Amino acid sequence: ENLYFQGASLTEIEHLVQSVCKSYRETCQLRLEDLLRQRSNIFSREEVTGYQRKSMWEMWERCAHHLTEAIQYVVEFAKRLSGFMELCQNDQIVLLKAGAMEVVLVRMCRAYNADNRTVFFEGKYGGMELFRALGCSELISSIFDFSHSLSALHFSEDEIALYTALVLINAHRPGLQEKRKVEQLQYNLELAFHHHLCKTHRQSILAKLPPKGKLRSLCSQHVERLQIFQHLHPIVVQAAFPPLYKELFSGG
């Protein structure tokens, strides 16, 4: 079926590095240089107050839509990732249901400016105060701190490519039918990320990477806050939340 479902040689692991990095460049949504250049474009006091005065449901709908836009690029990344399409449809759905949000949160660090603690949202950079109308402050500050700790690692685009590939191909996700096939794909992607870090003298970041439970805590926080919003405005979720967002975070 696929070469990376078996034990790969050094040269094949080298091909995998290049393959993962190509897949990511083609699906990274926004180019890094565009995000970096736009760092000077920050929302004014007036604009921040405008977002803060928006109704809770209005802000929830905008954030869910933007998050769905990013997730779509992650689905495209998985489709182009070596071996993912060779897995069964059950296992592809399992991996994306559990990992799409985690990949988006990793990818988000590119759009985060550590210097002034701002994130890129709807054309400009804004601090966490911009999201106050959502009424989920703990979760917003948890995403900002996570973006901050990743930003401190000074990830290259190639590093994000290889790390996110590994975030997606997790053989420990509950519900995987072909666990051994996934285990082997993960082991080769692991070798590819660690080979690239070795080749770029970047192995010092391995101990500095966040624990797996941290990304899981952020996804659990997001699902818990959505359920709270759902009880308050159920028809907002039912009529105006994107169908892909509902399929991943509420259950269809």
């Binding site: 449809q89 994306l96 169908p243 892909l244 399929e247 991943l248």
Partner: peptide, 10 residues
């Protein structure tokens, strides 16, 4: 529904 469709659309 949506995820199955995205994965099938080549």
């Amino acid at each position: 529904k949506i995820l199955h469709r995205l994965l099938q659309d080549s």
